[PDB]
């Protein structure tokens, strides 16, 4: 509709943790929010 990457950080958002940790977890992962959770709940 408008947002394209918030769609993604913001799925992420949802769990509640760092912003740096996401968005590098998205880029990284590249744009998949699945492998990003995956880490974004192994702390590192």
Same mark, same amino acid.
């Given at each position: 509709?408008? =947002?394209?990457?918030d769609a993604k950080?913001?799925?992420?958002?949802?769990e509640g943790y760092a912003?740096? =940790?996401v968005k590098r977890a998205l880029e990284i992962a590249?744009?998949?929010?699945?492998?990003?959770?995956?880490?974004?709940r192994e702390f590192a």
């Amino acid at each position: 509709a408008l =947002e394209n990457v918030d769609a993604k950080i913001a799925k992420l958002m949802g769990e509640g943790y760092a912003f740096e =940790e996401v968005k590098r977890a998205l880029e990284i992962a590249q744009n998949n929010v699945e492998v990003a959770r995956s880490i974004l709940r192994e702390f590192a």
